[PDB]
Amino acid sequence: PNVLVWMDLEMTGLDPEKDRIIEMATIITDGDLRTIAEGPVIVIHQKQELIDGMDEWNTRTHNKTGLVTKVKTSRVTERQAEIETLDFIQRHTLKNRAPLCGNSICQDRRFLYKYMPELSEWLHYRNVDVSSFKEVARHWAPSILSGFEKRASHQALDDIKESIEELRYYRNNLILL
User: What's the min distance (Å) between Cβ of 139 and a second copy?
Assistant: 3
Coil, helix or strand for 37? Answer: strand
Q: Is 125 a catalytic residue?
A: yes
Q: Which entry of a second copy, Mn ion, none binds 135, CB below 5 to 8 A by partner kind? A: a second copy
If the CB atoms of residues 40 and 99 are measured against a second copy, the closer one turns out to be 99
- Count other C-beta atoms under 10 Å from residue 155's C-beta: 13
Contact 54, 68 (CB under 8 A): no
Of these, 5, 42, 81, 105, which contacts a second copy (CB under 8 A)? 105
Q: Which entry of a second copy, Mn ion, none binds 2, CB below 5 to 8 A by partner kind? A: a second copy
Q: How many residues does the chain have?
A: 177
What are the contacts of 166-171 at 24+ separation with CB within 8 A? 166/103, 166/130, 166/134, 167/33, 167/101, 167/128, 167/130, 167/133, 168/33, 169/144, 170/130, 170/133, 170/134, 170/137, 170/144, 171/32, 171/33
Of these, 95, 141, 150, 158, which contacts a second copy (CB under 8 A)? 141
List phi, psi (to 5°) of 147: -80, 5
If the CB atoms of residues 80 and 155 are measured against Mn ion, the closer one turns out to be 155
Of these, 37, 76, 83, 136, which contacts a second copy (CB under 8 A)? 136
Q: Is 75 in the site for a second copy (CB under 8 A)?
A: no
- Count other C-beta atoms under 10 Å from residue 71's C-beta: 23
If the CB atoms of residues 47 and 171 are measured against a second copy, the closer one turns out to be 171
Radius of gyration of the chain (CA): 17
Q: Identify the active-site residue in 113, 115, 125, 169.
A: 125
Residues that bind a second copy (CB under 8 A): 2, 17, 31-32, 99, 105-106, 109-110, 126-129, 131-133, 135-136, 138-141, 143-144, 171, 173-177
Q: So which residues are the catalytic ones?
A: 125
